[PDB]
Amino acid sequence: NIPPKARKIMQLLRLIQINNGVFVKFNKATKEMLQVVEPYVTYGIPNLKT
Amino acid sequence: KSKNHTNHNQNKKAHRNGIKRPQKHRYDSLKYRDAKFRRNQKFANRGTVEAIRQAKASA
Amino acid sequence: KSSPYFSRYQTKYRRRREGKTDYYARKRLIAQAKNKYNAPKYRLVVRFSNRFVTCQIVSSRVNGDYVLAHAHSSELPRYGIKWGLANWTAAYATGLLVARRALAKVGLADKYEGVTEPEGEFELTEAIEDGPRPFKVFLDVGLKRTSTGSRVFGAMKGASDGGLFIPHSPNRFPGFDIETEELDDETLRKYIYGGHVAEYMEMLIDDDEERYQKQFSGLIADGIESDQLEDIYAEAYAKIREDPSFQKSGKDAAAFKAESLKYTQRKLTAEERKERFNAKVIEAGRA
Amino acid sequence: PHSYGIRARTRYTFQRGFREHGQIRLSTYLKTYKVGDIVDIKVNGAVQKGMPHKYYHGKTGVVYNVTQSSVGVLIYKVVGNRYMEKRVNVRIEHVKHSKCRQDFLDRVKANEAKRKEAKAQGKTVQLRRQPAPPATAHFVSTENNEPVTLHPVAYDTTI
Amino acid sequence: PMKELRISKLVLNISLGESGDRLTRAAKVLEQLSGQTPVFSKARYTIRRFGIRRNEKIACHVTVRGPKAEEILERGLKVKEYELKKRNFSATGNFGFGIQEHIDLGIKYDPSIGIYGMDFYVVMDRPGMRVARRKAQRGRVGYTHKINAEDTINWFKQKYDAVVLGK
Amino acid sequence: KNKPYPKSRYNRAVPDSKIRIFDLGRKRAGVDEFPLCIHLVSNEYEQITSEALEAARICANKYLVKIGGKDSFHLRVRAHPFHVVRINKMKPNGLVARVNIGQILMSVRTKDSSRATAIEALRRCQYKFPGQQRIIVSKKWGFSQYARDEYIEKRSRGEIIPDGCYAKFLNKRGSLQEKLDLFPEASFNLA
RNA sequence: GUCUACGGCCAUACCUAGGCGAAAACACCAGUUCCCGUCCGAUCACUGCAGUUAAGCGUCUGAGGGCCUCGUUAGUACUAUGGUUGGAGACAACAUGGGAAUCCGGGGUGCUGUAGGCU
RNA sequence: GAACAGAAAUCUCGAGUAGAAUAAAAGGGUAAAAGUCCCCUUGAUUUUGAUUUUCAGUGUGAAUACAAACCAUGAAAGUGUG
RNA sequence: AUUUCCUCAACCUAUUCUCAAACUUUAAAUAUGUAAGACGCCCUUGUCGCUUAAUUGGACGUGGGCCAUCGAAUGAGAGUU
RNA sequence: UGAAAGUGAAUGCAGGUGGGAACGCCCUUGUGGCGUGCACCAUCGACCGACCCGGAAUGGAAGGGUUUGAGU
Ligand SMILES: [Mg+2]
Ligand SMILES: [Mg+2]
């Protein structure tokens, strides 16, 4: 039940499976992509231990 | 009842093999160009080939 | 004249509001075929005021019009034409002048000399068999009507005889007959040398002498006779050819600039606007 | 209830703008078009000749041909599972240059202006555009700018 | 200065309103009175209640200017005893009237040709109205240079020793 | 519940709305009096028919006149039936009013002495209308756009000119001379 | 600077009323033989400079009308996305985002290219 | 305003952003015109390929920009393949 | 009474209540077209029967210099039969 | 190739241009530069037939053409 734009964005993020995780460099282009997939992902600032 | 049109699956079908783009070639046929331009380009190109041939040969 | 009438009003183009530019004709006059790219179309702009004749050779660009060459009938006395500076013959002379000025600028004056001694015969400057084609220009009559014998075609005749290639038919020259579709070179030669003006005065010497004195007052006070007119025009055309260059004037513009600022009104500010608004309300006795 | 005439459903698409009727500005005819130019298509309803179909209104393509009063423009249109090369003959009243094309031209020019200067000074050039970075650290002062404490406001009818 | 009112054009129209032998003899008398060719006004539209012939000549009129226009106006006033009323003068500065039995004017007459009525309408213009009439650079005349009814009445009373009704 | 379908050249064959009179009481009143206004506002998007409005106006006119007279109220009906509801005959059937949330249905300006009376009459009309409505007291003077405190200051300065029921409010726009003559008591202060 | 010819954008340029405009230019303006066209040299055509800034034209002023522009209106209206949110429903609130119009107020009332003239 | 006698038939002067006209529907377009009048005309012609729309990117219809001719019109730039 | 009175209608003006899928000066969100150089950037010179007043231009070329953020992000081997 | 009567395939290295397999050479450690360039595709020409041209009894040779063919 993933609509086409969000499905494509998660593919571009290499987030293809539930509970998968990636590091992303935060810029305006990345931020607007994460806005479209807000219901389908969660993200935040990781510390050094993480 | 007949006449049952819908576009529901048609967009999905188009994207299975994607929206293909045509191959882009270096040269397009001059048959799309103005005939007067095309006729003169034949003579211009013929002279360029002759001049390129002579300069290589005389070198 | 309600506000909705004004609100919805669309102004014509500025040069259409002041009745100067025919944009229908201007588009067809200057619009080059796109596969000729940046080759300019040249117009022979010919305009008449009440006293003088303006001849210009103009091309068009996106940002405005560019004058290749100009000739003004006010410069004719320098070549010896001091009277009738707005007539058919003056139109002819100022057309020949801009033709010689334009050809020098494009470096074709020696190759295309036009007619040295016009005899009023319809002809176009033919292209040299092996050499540059003649400089081509199109007539821009403006808002003047193109009736037979109009002065715009006199200036076009002069420019054509000056070596410029101007496409034209002789259907609007003075003396052309529409019944037989033939051009009488005699009347056309007459107009080129100002004989039509010569015949007017000679008629006026015979009858209504007081009308003659009132009409050609400029020509009388120089003691010019109708026989002289052909000679002055014929000599002026020759002087134009030998030296066509436009002598740039040396009048001091700074004096004109300084003079015109003194008579130039200034615009008020808000601080003064508040001052007069209070004063008028005070003088109204309602504050 | 569906006609397929050429200009069906173009009631607003082919309207001149409000207080923009009448004369066509003559700079449209003095623009120069060359093969390889990127042009925008925008139909002028006042020029019925050389009109492109409404599909091409608002589309951008490359000039492939130049005639006396018109340009041929290459446009790709989706017709199924692929794009199709369309060759539209448009009178130049319905065409204008893409403003980005001069922007791409100037950016490249500034790239080579930077690259040559950086080379002579013996330094890097850094010609790559970047997305808007995260905002940097600053030090907002409060002198003469003390915080104002807000509260949510009580409800009250304003009619 | 150049604020001198003068006659621009005098229009004279037949008021008979008939087509036939009377209409033709109207052209002859219009030609005689003016020295000019009497162009024929047409019927713009046929009417059911009158049956006016479409695109057929019904009325004839001429436009007269120049010094002979003043003479025609002068002989019109003489037969009018130089007496016109206030309401004749139009809001734009024109005035006109209408007189029957054009026999009273100074043209020889016979009882064979017929009796015809002949009107007057004088258009008034200061010099400089060419601005609004020329083809090129056609401007609009200023407010102060336009002609009002009061101005053309005073012009009428300044000469011709005329008087106007005090309604 | 489709898109608005009013009378038009495409919808010429229409019935007339059952309500034609929208103004009541002292319609030709002034600005000094009737200073207090009560509104009946629609709390939800309803489709009040012209029959329901016509019923309400008849009920409001009778009760208000009996209880206070004719010179102490300016009842008016804000909602207008312009949407056409269709039916299949035993084609257009009737006229209804599409009113959004917070649309005033009937507005009555009365004296402050009739504040309680105006509330009660506007309260009774809820039983005639469908949906839910609320009674509120306007913060504006009658049928104006200004607050009571502001209107008092405009009235005390002398910048208000009574024109029938409504009035003219001075503005900083237009020729001064006309503004000066029209407002005699007002002081065009020079700043 | 002003003016004239040809323009570009086509009202911060239009419409209105009233003040000013030295020089030149432009204009109004003086005629009808020739060219030319009209019921009419009004217009259009020619041929001129005796007269006039009065009209055009230019510039300045209106707590002018319109027009342009910036703010208020207003993150209000609307809207992409979200919930096993509320509510019988109508709709509403909230969440991650996008974001007007209109009115009202202040300011403004042509800029500019080429060529040539001008105490 | 003038006639005639209601008739704004006609004629004249002002204002007039198109509120008229443009064959037939509606929408779009158009003001020194695309409307009205006038003058001359047959580009409503012969030939070739390219293109757009409907679309399978087949046919048919309709349409666009050119080319080789031959012409019309205009002083001319141009415009004209209904 | 071709001198007036008002309820009579008509029109003009400024306010005023309320609307539009086949109204509109404005005008979103979402959706949508194109571009983000190596077929790229600067000069020397060649061709032509096209085009220009003209080696003028246009089109196609030749020879040299810019190959180190090769010119937003992210991802990914791709396309034709 | 043309309905047919008929006519019938090299200007050139059996042509030019772009990409390109494989190979060779130079760098200098790069996704290199340089030179040939198979297959294939796009493209500018040439050649044969048809058709449309002018075109100096029978033949159609040189010159052409926006075209046309399931050709070379
Ligand atoms: Mg939602
Ligand atoms: Mg869900």
Curated annotation (Swiss-Prot), chain A:
It is found in: Cytoplasm; Nucleus; Nucleus, Nucleolus. Belongs to the universal ribosomal protein uL30 family. There are 3 genes for uL30 in S.pombe. Component of the small ribosomal subunit (SSU). Mature yeast ribosomes consist of a small (40S) and a large (60S) subunit. The 40S small subunit contains 1 molecule of ribosomal RNA (18S rRNA) and at least 33 different proteins. The large 60S subunit contains 3 rRNA molecules (25S, 5.8S and 5S rRNA) and at least 46 different proteins. Component of the ribosome, a large ribonucleoprotein complex responsible for the synthesis of proteins in the cell. The small ribosomal subunit (SSU) binds messenger RNAs (mRNAs) and translates the encoded message by selecting cognate aminoacyl-transfer RNA (tRNA) molecules. The large subunit (LSU) contains the ribosomal catalytic site termed the peptidyl transferase center (PTC), which catalyzes the formation of peptide bonds, thereby polymerizing the amino acids delivered by tRNAs into a polypeptide chain. This is Large ribosomal subunit protein uL30C.
Swiss-Prot record, chain C:
InterPro entries: Rbsml_uL18_euk, Ribosomal_uL18_C_euk. Keywords: Cytoplasm, Nucleus, Ribonucleoprotein, Ribosomal protein, RNA-binding, rRNA-binding. GO terms for cellular component: cytosol; cytosolic large ribosomal subunit; nucleus. GO terms for biological process: cytoplasmic translation; ribosomal large subunit assembly. It is found in: Cytoplasm; Nucleus. One of its GO terms (molecular function) is structural constituent of ribosome. Component of the large ribosomal subunit (LSU). Mature yeast ribosomes consist of a small (40S) and a large (60S) subunit. The 40S small subunit contains 1 molecule of ribosomal RNA (18S rRNA) and 33 different proteins (encoded by 57 genes). The large 60S subunit contains 3 rRNA molecules (25S, 5.8S and 5S rRNA) and 46 different proteins (encoded by 81 genes). Component of a hexameric 5S RNP precursor complex, composed of 5S RNA, rrs1, rpf2, rpl5a/rpl5b, rpl11a/rpl11b and syo1; this complex acts as a precursor for ribosome assembly. HAMAP family: Ribosomal_uL18_A. PANTHER family: LARGE RIBOSOMAL SUBUNIT PROTEIN UL18, RIBOSOMAL PROTEIN L5-RELATED. There are 2 genes for uL18 in S.pombe. This is Large ribosomal subunit protein uL18B.
UniProtKB/Swiss-Prot annotation, chain E:
SUPFAM superfamilies: RL5-like (SSF55282). The keyword RNA-binding applies. Keywords: Cytoplasm, Nucleus, Ribonucleoprotein, Ribosomal protein, RNA-binding, rRNA-binding. It comes from the Eukaryota. GO terms for molecular function: RNA binding; rRNA binding; structural constituent of ribosome. Coiled coil: none annotated. It is found in: Cytoplasm; Nucleus. GO terms for cellular component: cytosol; cytosolic large ribosomal subunit; cytosolic small ribosomal subunit; nucleus. Signal peptide: none annotated. GO terms for biological process: cytoplasmic translation; ribosome biogenesis; translation. Component of the large ribosomal subunit (LSU). Mature yeast ribosomes consist of a small (40S) and a large (60S) subunit. The 40S small subunit contains 1 molecule of ribosomal RNA (18S rRNA) and 33 different proteins (encoded by 57 genes). The large 60S subunit contains 3 rRNA molecules (25S, 5.8S and 5S rRNA) and 46 different proteins (encoded by 81 genes). Component of a hexameric 5S RNP precursor complex; this complex acts as a precursor for ribosome assembly. rpl11a/rpl11b/uL5 forms a heterotrimeric complex with rpl5a/rpl5b/uL18 and syo1. There are 2 genes for uL5 in S.pombe. Belongs to the universal ribosomal protein uL5 family. This is Large ribosomal subunit protein uL5A. It comes from Schizosaccharomyces pombe (strain 972 / ATCC 24843) (Fission yeast). The gene is rpl1101.
Curated annotation (Swiss-Prot), chain F:
GO terms for biological process: cytoplasmic translation; translation. Keywords: Cytoplasm, Ribonucleoprotein, Ribosomal protein. CDD domains: Ribosomal_L16_L10e. GO terms for molecular function: structural constituent of ribosome. It comes from the Eukaryota. GO terms for cellular component: cytosol; cytosolic large ribosomal subunit. Component of the ribosome, a large ribonucleoprotein complex responsible for the synthesis of proteins in the cell. The small ribosomal subunit (SSU) binds messenger RNAs (mRNAs) and translates the encoded message by selecting cognate aminoacyl-transfer RNA (tRNA) molecules. The large subunit (LSU) contains the ribosomal catalytic site termed the peptidyl transferase center (PTC), which catalyzes the formation of peptide bonds, thereby polymerizing the amino acids delivered by tRNAs into a polypeptide chain. There are 2 genes for uL16 in S.pombe. NCBIfam families: PRK04199.1-4, uL16_euk_arch. Component of the large ribosomal subunit (LSU). Mature yeast ribosomes consist of a small (40S) and a large (60S) subunit. The 40S small subunit contains 1 molecule of ribosomal RNA (18S rRNA) and at least 33 different proteins. The large 60S subunit contains 3 rRNA molecules (25S, 5.8S and 5S rRNA) and at least 46 different proteins. Belongs to the universal ribosomal protein uL16 family. This is Large ribosomal subunit protein uL16A. The lineage of its organism: Eukaryota, Fungi, Dikarya, Ascomycota, Taphrinomycotina.
